[PDB]
């Protein structure tokens, strides 16, 4: 019912110019190994990419990274149409500007540091209005294509002139920053994400379904695991990734308000999540609010839990809002929070495995220049019981250590850090060694 | 009429052979597009009923006869001098249907119903909490015959060794007082729920209060089969669906479990079928929801999570 309509799935290839289909689909569509394609999605939007084959992709689905997925205004699960675009040709001019909130903090020649490397002999196809990301100098810069000579699409070839007229455009509301949490910023968890994903899929993406249906979707999702496991990161991603409205509640934070002023906040919070539903309410250190078991004691401490219980049971309505909480383990939480209609779903986010760390390591080093001697697999292999928060700290320390030896001693700090400088600096295996040895 | 995962209520506005007739293959059926508004004295069928409860039987038999006279024949007690049971306590783990049971007996007996929830009461400010208990009891009496169901009771009365608070105690006592305060004209019965005796304040047992107890265990094999049926009556089940099997493998489940199991099997079905064809987020079409059928495969997926 249109051989060219596919379900936007996740990417295997992190490159902004490629999208993957399955060979049988490439046949049915008569597409080849490197063909440039025209992709149509929502809000009457389009994108141009290179299509490769992917034996793990299904005939119906299409793999595409978050950059393209945004250029198209679609979320995972959504459907787009694909059409060949052989008529595309070498670009003449190209005007692009950086998105202001992605270059604050730096000064220098971005073109040299970012554009030049990014395009260089890659022949990336671009459509006007495209927004693309480029990583370097320990950060990522967002660029919008303001206009292309062969309009509205063309390939950026070694001859294509690239204008970058010095004024950073301001981001437009409906243009989510790529610097946002995504499923692509989570590693290790997979089965857990698979579960959570399907749990919120319908209620958060197809609300009307529940207006017309009589079945009950899961209402509360509880996340188990030690600190720095990515529970918050996971919840924030599912929200972003699903266009859902997000509202974070933090125990310590709530539990520091004066008696009564504390509950007024819980309610004001829930009350707001509903205003913007579909929404996800994430209670951070939950056990900081609901421990009741044997450890609860206080004509306020108890008055709060009860308040949370009430607020929980208060859910159930139109566009649904789901509640996600986090704690280290069952035992911590008030048994009352389990009572079905409340936190009736549970997900245990263990500690990554060897592969999981390798994955996590990659995610946290994507914006930095790693020397060829850097062996992340080794690093992954020796960090047995680490959790994401650990690995991230490990990367952060290896980079700061690198910054202290190199840049630091030459001394070009405390001023207005130059991109070219930060861009040249490379973290070495020696730098990770230093970090792993503290 | 059940379908598309819901039930629609229809009123017969007029029949040709009036006022009664048979609807035969030839009978024309008009359905002129305007949905009439329900009339107060026309209880929705979408209400809890004894027919929405499965597993319990002996317990319902008991509770039924307990409230029969006081809630259906109040004058009897105006003319008589005997005392009807005053408080009915419901024992059992979570999701056993205690609330459902109490709500049904009320509906089913034309009784006025008023739900009180511990967590809910126990979240009001000190004093503001008791004012509510009283306002609640006070209202149940205004509309007697009535049934007052205190939900998580132990959330209000645990006193044994676990009570501690110049408010926590002030509340229980308040409940005790309110209990003893009953006894009047058209009687109102109080029903509470907890997981077990031990949880509750021993004071609540003192005869004239919660003097009657009913233990709602976990369903048996037949009980689950029953419960399963109740929660799948509005959905289209494929011929391969074997509820008896499903019932047979869910040993220690309770109604809340089985209901969740059905809900998940249907949402799973909705995600494969409808979902991928993609006809959601708009204004869901009956015909669509009506065609979709949950398969044994869908219950398998649910039972395997
Ligand atoms: N699975 C993961 N993938 C990538 N980074 C992770 C992961 N788990 C943790 N992290 C890193 O650790 C920090 C962990 O904190 P957070 O997400 O708040 O987790 P938690 O709620 O368990 O403390 C995150 O911001 C992220 O940088
Ligand atoms: N015996 C039963 N028959 C049918 N459904 C049941 C039964 N017991 C529980 N359920 C389902 O589980 C949910 C159980 O919650 P509830 O009635 O509030 O029970 P409890 O008060 O024990 O938590 C009910 O709304 C109903 O959908």
Swiss-Prot record, chain A:
Modified residue N6,N6,N6-trimethyllysine is at which positions?
Answer: 295
The record's tissue-specificity note reads: Expressed in the prefrontal cortex (at protein level).
Q: What is its EC number?
A: 3.6.4.6
Reactions the enzyme catalyzes? ATP + H2O = ADP + phosphate + H(+)
List modified residues, type Phosphothreonine: 416
Subcellular location per the Swiss-Prot or TrEMBL entry? Cytoplasm, Cytosol; Endoplasmic reticulum; Nucleus; Cytoplasm, Stress granule
GO biological process terms on file? aggresome assembly; ATP metabolic process; autophagosome maturation; autophagy; cellular response to arsenite ion; cellular response to heat; cellular response to misfolded protein; cytoplasm protein quality control
Q: Binding of ATP 1: at which residues?
A: 227-233, 328, 364
Q: Which GO terms describe its molecular function?
A: ADP binding; ATP binding; ATP hydrolysis activity; BAT3 complex binding; deubiquitinase activator activity; identical protein binding; K48-linked polyubiquitin modification-dependent protein binding; lipid binding
What does the UniProt keyword field contain?
A: Acetylation, ATP-binding, Autophagy, Cytoplasm, DNA damage, DNA repair, Endoplasmic reticulum, Hydrolase, Isopeptide bond, Lipid-binding, Methylation, Nucleotide-binding, Nucleus, Phosphoprotein, Transport, Ubl conjugation, Ubl conjugation pathway
Q: Which residues carry this modification: Phosphoserine?
A: 17
GO CC list: ATPase complex; ciliary basal body; cytoplasm; cytoplasmic stress granule; cytosol; Derlin-1 retrotranslocation complex; endoplasmic reticulum; endoplasmic reticulum membrane
Primary subcellular site in the record, as a coarse category? cytoplasm
Tell me how the protein is altered or processed after translation: Phosphorylated by tyrosine kinases in response to T-cell antigen receptor activation. Phosphorylated in mitotic cells.
Q: How does it assemble?
A: Homohexamer. Forms a ring-shaped particle of 12.5 nm diameter, that displays 6-fold radial symmetry. Part of a ternary complex containing STX5A, NSFL1C and VCP. NSFL1C forms a homotrimer that binds to one end of a VCP homohexamer. The complex binds to membranes enriched in phosphatidylethanolamine-containing lipids and promotes Golgi membrane fusion. Binds to a heterodimer of NPLOC4 and UFD1, binding to this heterodimer inhibits Golgi-membrane fusion. Interaction with VCIP135 leads to dissociation of the complex via ATP hydrolysis by VCP.
Functional summary from the UniProt entry: Necessary for the fragmentation of Golgi stacks during mitosis and for their reassembly after mitosis. Involved in the formation of the transitional endoplasmic reticulum (tER). The transfer of membranes from the endoplasmic reticulum to the Golgi apparatus occurs via 50-70 nm transition vesicles which derive from part-rough, part-smooth transitional elements of the endoplasmic reticulum (tER). Vesicle budding from the tER is an ATP-dependent process.
Q: What is known of its domains?
A: The N-terminal domain shows evolutionary conservation with that of PEX1, and is able to bind phospholipids with a preference for phosphatidylinositol mono- and bisphosphates. The PIM (PUB-interaction motif) motif mediates interaction with the PUB domain of RNF31.
The similarity annotation says: Belongs to the AAA ATPase family.
| Annotated protein name in UniProt | Transitional endoplasmic reticulum ATPase
Residues represented out of the complete protein: 21 to 458 of 806
């Amino acid at each position: 019912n249109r051989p060219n309509r596919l379900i936007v799935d996740e990417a295997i290839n992190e490159d902004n110019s490629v999208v993957s289909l399955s060979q049988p689909k490439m046949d049915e569509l008569q597409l080849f190994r490197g063909d440039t394609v025209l992709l149509k999605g929502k809000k009457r939007r389009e994108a141009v990419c290179i299509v490769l084959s992917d034996d793990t992709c299904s005939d119906e689905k299409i793999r595409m990274n978050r950059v393209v997925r945004n250029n198209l205004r679609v979320r995972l699960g959504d459907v787009i149409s694909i059409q060949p675009c052989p008529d595309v040709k070498y670009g003449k001019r190209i005007h692009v500007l950086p998105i202001d909130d992605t270059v604050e903090g730096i000064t220098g020649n971005l073109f040299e540091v970012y554009l030049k490397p990014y395009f260089l002999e890659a022949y990336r196809p671009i459509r006007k209005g495209d927004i693309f990301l480029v990583r370097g100098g320990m950060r990522a810069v967002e660029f919008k294509v303001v206009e292309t000579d062969p309009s509205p699409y063309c390939i950026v070839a070694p001859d294509t002139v690239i204008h970058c007229e010095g004024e950073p455009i301001k981001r437009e509301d409906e243009e989510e920053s790529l610097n946002e949490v995504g499923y692509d910023d989570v590693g290790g968890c997979r089965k857990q994400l698979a579960q959570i994903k399907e749990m919120v899929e319908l209620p958060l993406r197809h609300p009307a379904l529940f207006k017309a249906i009589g079945v009950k979707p899961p209402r509360g999702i509880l996340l188990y695991g030690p600190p720095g496991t990515g529970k918050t990161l996971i919840a924030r991603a599912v929200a972003n990734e699903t266009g859902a409205f997000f509202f974070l509640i933090n125990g310590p934070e709530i539990m520091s308000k004066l008696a009564g002023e504390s509950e007024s906040n819980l309610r004001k919070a829930f009350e707001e999540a509903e205003k913007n539903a579909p929404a996800i309410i994430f209670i951070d250190e939950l056990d900081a609010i609901a421990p009741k078991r044997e450890k609860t004691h206080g004509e306020v401490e108890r008055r709060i839990v009860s308040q949370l219980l009430t607020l929980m049971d208060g859910l159930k309505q139109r566009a649904h809002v789901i509640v996600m909480a986090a704690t280290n383990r069952p035992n911590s939480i008030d048994p009352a929070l389990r009572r079905f209609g409340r936190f009736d779903r549970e997900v245990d986010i263990g500690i990554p495995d060897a592969t999981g760390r390798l994955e996590i390591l990659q995610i946290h080093t994507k914006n930095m220049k790693l020397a060829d001697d850097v062996d992340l697999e080794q690093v992954a292999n020796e960090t047995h019981g680490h959790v994401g928060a650990d690995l991230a700290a490990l990367c952060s320390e290896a980079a700061l250590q690198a910054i202290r030896k190199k840049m630091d001693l030459i001394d070009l700090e405390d001023e207005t850090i130059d991109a070219e400088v930060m861009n040249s600096l490379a973290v070495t295996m020696d730098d990770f060694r230093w970090a792993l040895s503290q």
